[PDB]
Amino acid sequence: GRQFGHLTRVRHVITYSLSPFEQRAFPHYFSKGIPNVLRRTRACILRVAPPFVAFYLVYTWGTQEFEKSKRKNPA
Amino acid sequence: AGGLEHRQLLDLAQKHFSGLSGTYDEDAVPTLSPCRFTGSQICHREDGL
């Protein structure tokens, strides 16, 4: 295990904190929240979306072929 | 405070402190406003101490 007081070394760093009864738990939830969600999705969409679009195209083609491959031809 | 009669101290006050500003001060009094107390925390981390 590991304990507080034996983790690492830190110097010259100040932390200011406020009590949770002095502040609001939902401050600017929609005012600042939505623009941050847009930035987060914008920053990662190009890395996540393409492979799942690639899956979507294979999925529709493969079923479209199979769904009609067992249709009959005049010959 | 010490070995001294209050008469003497008042005589000296009326002598050497009469030149002070009167009771009125031209409407500019310091009125201490209440001071908000805030539950909060400040940590200055310094492991070299």
Swiss-Prot record, chain A:
Q: Where does the record place it?
A: Mitochondrion inner membrane
GO biological process: any one? hypothalamus development
UniProt keyword list: Acetylation, Electron transport, Membrane, Mitochondrion, Mitochondrion inner membrane, Respiratory chain, Transmembrane, Transmembrane helix, Transport
Residue numbers bearing the N6-acetyllysine modification: 32
Q: How does it sit in the bilayer?
A: Single-pass membrane protein
Q: What is its main location?
A: mitochondrion
The Gene Ontology CC terms held by the record are: mitochondrial inner membrane; respiratory chain complex III
Superkingdom of the source? Eukaryota
Q: Mark the residues carrying the PTM N6-succinyllysine.
A: 32
- Side of membrane Mitochondrial matrix, spans: 1-38
Tell me which InterPro entries the record gives. Answer: Cyt_bc1_su8, Cyt_bc1_su8_sf
Gene3D superfamilies in UniProt: Cytochrome b-c1 complex subunit 8
What residue ranges carry the coiled-coil annotation? none
PANTHER family linked = CYTOCHROME B-C1 COMPLEX SUBUNIT 8, UBIQUINOL-CYTOCHROME C REDUCTASE COMPLEX UBIQUINONE-BINDING PROTEIN QP-C
What does this chain do? Component of the ubiquinol-cytochrome c oxidoreductase, a multisubunit transmembrane complex that is part of the mitochondrial electron transport chain which drives oxidative phosphorylation.
Q: How does it assemble?
A: Component of the ubiquinol-cytochrome c oxidoreductase (cytochrome b-c1 complex, complex III, CIII), a multisubunit enzyme composed of 11 subunits. The complex is composed of 3 respiratory subunits cytochrome b, cytochrome c1 and Rieske protein UQCRFS1, 2 core protein subunits UQCRC1/QCR1 and UQCRC2/QCR2, and 6 low-molecular weight protein subunits UQCRH/QCR6, UQCRB/QCR7, UQCRQ/QCR8, UQCR10/QCR9, UQCR11/QCR10 and subunit 9, the cleavage product of Rieske protein UQCRFS1.
Q: Which family does it belong to?
A: Belongs to the UQCRQ/QCR8 family.
What's this protein's name? Cytochrome b-c1 complex subunit 8
Organism lineage string? Eukaryota, Metazoa, Chordata, Craniata, Vertebrata
From Swiss-Prot, chain B:
Subcellular location(s) per record = Mitochondrion inner membrane
Provide the positions where the record notes the PTM N6-acetyllysine: 15
Signal sequence bounds: none
Cysteines paired by S-S bonds: none
Domain of life of the organism in this record? Eukaryota
Q: How does it assemble?
A: Component of the ubiquinol-cytochrome c oxidoreductase (cytochrome b-c1 complex, complex III, CIII), a multisubunit enzyme composed of 11 subunits. The complex is composed of 3 respiratory subunits cytochrome b, cytochrome c1 and Rieske protein UQCRFS1, 2 core protein subunits UQCRC1/QCR1 and UQCRC2/QCR2, and 6 low-molecular weight protein subunits UQCRH/QCR6, UQCRB/QCR7, UQCRQ/QCR8, UQCR10/QCR9, UQCR11/QCR10 and subunit 9, the cleavage product of Rieske protein UQCRFS1.
What role does this protein play? Component of the ubiquinol-cytochrome c oxidoreductase, a multisubunit transmembrane complex that is part of the mitochondrial electron transport chain which drives oxidative phosphorylation.
Protein family according to the UniProt entry:
Belongs to the peptidase M16 family. UQCRC1/QCR1 subfamily.
Protein name, per record: Cytochrome b-c1 complex subunit 1, mitochondrial
Species annotation: Bos taurus (Bovine)
Residues shown, of full length: 234 to 282 of 480
